[PDB]
Design a binder for these strands. Sequence first.
RNA 1: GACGCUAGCGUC
RNA 2: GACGCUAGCGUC
Lengths: 121, 120
Amino acid sequence: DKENKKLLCRKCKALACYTADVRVIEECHYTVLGDAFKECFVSRPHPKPKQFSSFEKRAKIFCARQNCSHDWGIHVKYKTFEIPVIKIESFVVEDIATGVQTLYSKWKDFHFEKIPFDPAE
Amino acid sequence: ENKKLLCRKCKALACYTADVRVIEECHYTVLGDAFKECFVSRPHPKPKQFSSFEKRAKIFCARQNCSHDWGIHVKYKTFEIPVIKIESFVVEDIATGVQTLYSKWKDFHFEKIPFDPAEM
RNA sequence: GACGCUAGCGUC
RNA sequence: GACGCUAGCGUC
Ligand SMILES: [Zn+2]
Ligand SMILES: [Zn+2]
């Protein structure tokens, strides 16, 4: 099934977002739309910011819970956007209908409705 | 179908899948003296005990300018046999020449004959 | 060897 | 972020 699911912080199990809000960039990197998600993480400047492809890595992002702060990925400037790029190995996927939890390590293995990124949203 | 194993670094022939035997559905060895000629052994720098056999030596390609790490040599029951890691080799289908790079034994599906003490 | 983990480095 | 490579540590 490619039904909607929620991502929970792997360390504290707090809700982070839903698969409906996830968008794919270059069929390789995954970001999250919406302002609600922006409240769920904090950023911190990247100690070794490197550049590659079409965007620029500025900071790492972590769980906003002060009792977690699990590494969630990075924040990058892509074209004219400042957007979060998350790594799936930092989360637990939960199916909304059953509660079943899955621990993935790479995005290639997680098969869900991978809605491509739309600059208009 | 039968396949041969080549050294990942220099592509030298190591053995054929027909000679491979599985111990406790988890560790892979090879029978016959021909294979014994293709590798050299070396006392393991971190020997240790687990399950039913002791890790005594590290083994490497005998070809010297290659010397690619192939695994270890162990004492298992009344035999001392080599145990190899597929990640150190290229699998080539003999009929087609197609070369395959595996990382884990779980992924290479072939006739996995269990080790039998009466042979070798 | 079979798996897991930490650190570091390299490419777009 | 996505891969890739080292080194070390642990378990059986
Ligand atoms: Zn958390
Ligand atoms: Zn070799």
